Amino acid sequence: SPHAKYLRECLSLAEKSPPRPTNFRVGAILVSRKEGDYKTEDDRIVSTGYTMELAGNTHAEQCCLSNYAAVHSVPEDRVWEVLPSEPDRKLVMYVTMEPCGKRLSGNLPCVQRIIRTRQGDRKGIQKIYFGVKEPGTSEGCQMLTAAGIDWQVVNGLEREILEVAVAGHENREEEVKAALDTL
Ligand SMILES: Nc1nc(=O)c(N)c(NC[C@H](O)[C@H](O)[C@H](O)COP(=O)(O)O)[nH]1
Numbered sequence: 001s002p003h004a005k006y007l008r009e010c011l012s013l014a015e016k017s018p019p020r021p022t023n024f025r026v027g028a029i030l031v032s033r034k035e036g037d038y039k040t041e042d043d044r045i046v047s048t049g050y051t052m053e054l055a056g057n058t059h060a061e062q063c064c065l066s067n068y069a070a071v072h073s074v075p076e077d078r079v080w081e082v083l084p085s086e087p088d089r090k091l092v093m094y095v096t097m098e099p100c101g102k103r104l105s106g107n108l109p110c111v112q113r114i115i116r117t118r119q120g121d122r123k124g125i126q127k128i129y130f131g132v133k134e135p136g137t138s139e140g141c142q143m144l145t146a147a148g149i150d151w152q153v154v155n156g157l158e159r160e161i162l163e164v165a166v167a168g169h170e171n172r173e174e175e176v177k178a179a180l181d182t183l
């Protein structure tokens with residue numbers, strides 16, 4: 001699976017995140033892919049990010065978009081203006097964890113940062129590949145569906161993604177076990 005390989009590279013990015021009690025260590029990779037029977041060799045990496053890579057309370061997907069925006073001299077909320085939008089290619093994002101539909105901090109959730117890349121004549125991010133649903137007791141995937149963003153869960157990496165994600169948590173072992181039980 002090309003998707004599993006991408007998610008393992010997202011995991012390596014997630015491992016750069018500093019452990020904190022209030023969030024998850026996640027990694028994200030933005031890819032430009034040819035429409036149709038694509039060859040993975042023709043994939044182009046557009047950006048990458050990981051949790052708290054950039055100053056402030058930042059998520060992996062947020063840093064991925066903000067890294068691109070910074071190179072292009074716009075704030076991240078304007079990254080839709082400068083992302084590629086080529087007729088024969090689509091933007092897809094790999095993320096270890098399901099993008100968030102709500103943040104306890106009140107920051108704009110990652111599903112909304114993804115949705116707003118589709119503005120004006122720009123195609124934006126068309127599909128999300130992720131490895132685990134967000135752990136815990138309105139789901140991000142449902143918000144993506146409602147806005148017309150495709151997504152696909154890539155199975156097989158759940159334990160490794162979760163153990164990295166919750167390394168900064170006191171309840172990490174129970175948290176991982178609970179999340180695997182939802183499979
Ligand atoms: N996909 C994803 N990538 C991340 O980089 C990250 N940190 C989360 N975590 C989602 C979780 O719901 C939020 O971490 C809490 O809601 C606390 O909110 P803040 O992070 O402090 O804004 N999820």
Ligand SMILES: [Zn+2]
Nearest residue numbers: 059100109110
């Ligand atoms: Zn998020």
